């Protein structure tokens, strides 16, 4: 679809077999989400931004739809505010910026 | 343009009578620049990011440029390790989401 950003440009994936809310983010190189169930092995990271850096967890080769559209990427679990989909899947579903 | 995401989405602005590479962030409220010399009045205020808070000034009707495009809205300066360009601006210049 395309859109506006007069609202926080909120979108419905579905990961781990679970529903959520994540804010579609450019500025974001990676895909973070706040704490959550998710199987499979992962290693200890750490990430920066405002602010600070937090310690997380990594994640790859792990599927997850956003807004519909498929996808299978790097999915960093740990203490981030809001859930965040960054350009590594923000490019796997073709997003772009325009204006 | 359409700015695909493959690469940090990075565009030129000019503010303050000075030019300087910002981040086109969808996920962020505010734009938010590094410290730098600013005219004009401005306000304490405390933002948060993925890491924590950190306080910057705020200035209103601040005239900038983003990639050729005038705009004019609030800009805050503070600690921040990206320039940051804000859905508050973005908005101003008709960026988009868009996939
Ligand atoms: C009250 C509170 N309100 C809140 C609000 O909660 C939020 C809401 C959104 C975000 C995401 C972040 N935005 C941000 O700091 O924006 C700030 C400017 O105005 C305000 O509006 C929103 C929060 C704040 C950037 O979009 C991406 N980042 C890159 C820039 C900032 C350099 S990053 O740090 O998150 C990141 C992500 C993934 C990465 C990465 C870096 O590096 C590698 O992978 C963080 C906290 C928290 S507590
Ligand atoms: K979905
Ligand atoms: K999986
Ligand atoms: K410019
Ligand atoms: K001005």
Redesign the interface.
């Known amino acids: 679809?395309?859109?506006?950003?007069?609202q926080?440009?909120l979108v419905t994936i579905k990961i781990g077999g679970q529903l959520k809310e994540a804010?579609?983010?450019?500025?974001?190189?990676d895909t973070?989400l706040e704490e959550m169930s998710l199987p499979g092995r992962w290693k200890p990271k750490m990430?920066?931004?405002?602010?600070?850096?937090?310690k997380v967890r990594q994640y790859d080769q792990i599927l997850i739809e956003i807004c519909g559209?498929k996808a299978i990427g790097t999915v960093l679990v740990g203490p981030?505010?809001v859930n965040?989909i960054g350009?590594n899947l923000?490019?796997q579903?073709?997003?772009?910026?325009?204006?």
Do not use: E, S
Not at 23 to 29: V, Y
Not at 93 to 99: A, E, M, P, S
């Open positions: 679809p395309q859109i506006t950003l007069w926080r440009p804010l579609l983010d450019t500025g974001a190189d973070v990430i920066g931004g405002i602010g600070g850096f937090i559209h981030t505010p965040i350009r923000l490019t579903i073709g997003c772009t910026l325009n204006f």
